[PDB]
Design a protein around this ligand. Structure first.
Ligand SMILES: [Zn+2]
Ligand SMILES: [Zn+2]
Lengths: 148, 72
């Protein structure tokens, strides 16, 4: 049973090296159910906010990707009303070499750099392409309303 | 076919691990290689535990877990 072992080893590695940009841990005693917090990157409309995410590890992890979703609402082109994320490594580009730490780093980078090419919400991607001040302002609004 | 068959898997080399070799950690299981482990070697020179990469190479995909390179 590689899943439990690797999840424990990953939690140990996160204890030894804490990433300032995010922090995660098992919600209770279900090692296959974690809760993560991603901090808003500086000089970004999400600055100052703290976004919570739920993570479910499959039983044959790391061979299948974890289910990651946003519980805190966020105004982002690639993130849904219910909170799903259009990230390749969670769907098509999953690899057994990826850790939950690398997944949270990829999510932080997607927050820093949204992907307009294939968006989960077309309206926000259009705003980003056309009106960036409106995009930054609406994301600031949403961060003040929900992330705080 | 995306996956590899077992006869294709057996054509990839298996290296016995000596303490001084070029690999250190199995990118999959994240543990350090121990003296005597069997390692599957890929065409791109990436290596893993047999017990770790063989299930991925056969059950799921035939690409490298690190560099996405197909294994032919
Ligand atoms: Zn291994
Ligand atoms: Zn490779």
């Amino acid at each position: 049973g590689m899943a439990l072992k690797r999840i424990h080893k990953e939690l140990n590695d996160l204890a030894r090296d804490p990433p300032a940009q995010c922090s995660a841990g098992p919600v209770g005693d279900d090692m296959f159910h974690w809760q993560a917090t991603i901090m808003g990157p500086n000089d970004s409309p999400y600055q100052g906010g703290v976004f919570f995410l739920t993570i479910h590890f499959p039983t044959d992890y790391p061979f299948k990707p974890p289910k990651v979703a946003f519980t805190t609402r966020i105004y982002h082109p690639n993130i849904n009303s219910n909170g799903s994320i259009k990230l390749d490594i969670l769907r098509s580009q999953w690899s057994p070499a990826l850790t939950i730490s690398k997944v949270l780093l990829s999510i932080c980078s997607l927050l820093c750099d949204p992907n307009p090419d294939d968006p989960l919400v077309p309206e926000i991607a259009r705003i980003y392409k056309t009106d960036r001040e409106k995009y930054n302002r609406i994301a600031r609004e949403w961060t003040q309303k929900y992330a705080m | 076919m995306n996956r590899l068959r077992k006869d294709q898997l057996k054509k990839l080399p298996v290296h016995k691990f000596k303490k001084g070799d070029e690999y250190d950690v199995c990118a999959i299981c994240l543990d350090e290689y121990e003296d005597g482990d069997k390692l599957r070697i890929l065409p791109c020179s990436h290596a893993y535990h047999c017990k770790c990469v063989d299930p991925w190479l056969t059950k799921t995909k035939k690409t490298c877990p690190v560099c996405k390179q197909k294994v032919v």
